Amino acid sequence: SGEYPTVNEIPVGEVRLYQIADGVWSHIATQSFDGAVYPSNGLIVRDGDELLLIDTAWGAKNTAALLAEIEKQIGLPVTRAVSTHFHDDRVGGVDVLRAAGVATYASPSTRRLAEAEGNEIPTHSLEGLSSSGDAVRFGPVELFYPGAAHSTDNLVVYVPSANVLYGGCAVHELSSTSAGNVADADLAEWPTSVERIQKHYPEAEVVIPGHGLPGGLDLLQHTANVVKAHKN
């Protein structure tokens, strides 16, 4: 009833949307992994009379449910999707998207990693993002490569019309107590990558993590704090 959704308020196998700003929503879904249940976020950005999707809903059935939820709540077609790194919470569901008319994109680094690990593979490569600090425009968003953090390929997304910073899994929520799933992370570089985000997007008003609650700019510093203490 208007609070940011959590695993306790999303019915089994469903997806919820949350209005972030004019023409900006997050999507929230839950998934099981290694015997525990986790939420995850993605983004939806209005692109004229179409929608840009950032990240899948962590699995094929969740991503089908996402599309249905968008049709119900928004009613504009999703025409393009970007996955912000190679893990299943970002790309699992790309095959569903691709069979629903959505053109799927990711960096060449994400595509290589997804292929190597047996995850679903976005169709199109996003050039111009291979060097730390790189940024490109993609419809109504800017895509930014901050450097290695949660993964070596992680991208962040900025919505300049609304000053919304979608950090993806490079950014953690304020309640976090450790740096999440660090299997593919660079803990030593991650603070430097977060500093790059803070320097590039100082006017961000909303910051959305890859998992958990949105907040303000403090999510960035909090992230650096939890990563440095996880590494220690």
Give the residues lining the site for Zn ion (CB under 5 A): 87, 89, 169, 210
Nearest to Zn ion of 17, 169 (CB atom): 169
SS3 127: coil
* Cα torsion angle, 132, 138, 142, 148, sign: negative
Q: Could you say which of 8, 131, 177, 232 contacts ligand YMB (CB under 6 A)?
A: 177
Active site residue 47: no
Give the Cβ contact number of residue 83 at 10 Å.
33
For the beta carbon of residue 134, count every other beta carbon within 10 angstroms: 16
**Which of 169, 197, 220, 224 touches ligand YMB by CB under 6 A?**
169
Q: Which of 27, 150, 172, 222 is flagged as catalytic?
A: 150
| Strand segments (E) across the chain | 16-21, 24-33, 36-47, 50-54, 78-82, 103-106, 124-125, 135-138, 141-144, 156-159, 164-168, 206-209
**Distances from the Cα of 230 to the Cαs of 112, 147, 172, in angstroms?**
28, 19, 13
- The response to whether 150 counts as a known ligand-binding position is yes
The residue from 55, 88, 153, 186 that contacts ligand YMB (CB under 6 A) is: 88
Helix 218-231 crosses helix 190-200 at what angle (to 10 degrees)?
A: 170
- Residue 120 is a binding residue for ligand YMB (CB under 6 A): no
CA distance between the termini of the chain: 40
Specify whether the CB–CB gap between 23 and 46 falls below 8 A: yes
Q: Which does 183 bind (CB under 5 to 8 A by kind): ligand YMB, Zn ion, none?
A: ligand YMB
Q: How far is the CB of 27 from Zn ion (least distance, A)?
A: 14
CB of 102 vs Zn ion, minimal distance in Å: 21
Least distance to Zn ion from the beta carbon of 56, Å?
Answer: 11
String of contacts with ligand YMB for each residue 21-40, x by CB under 6 A: ------------x----x--
The residues assigned a catalytic role are 85, 87, 89, 150, 181
User: Could you tell me which residues are annotated as the binding site for Zn(2+)?
Assistant: 85, 87, 89, 125, 127, 150, 169, 211
Q: Write out the residues near ligand YMB by the rule CB under 6 A.
A: 33, 38, 87-89, 117, 150, 169, 172, 176-178, 180-181, 183-184, 210-211
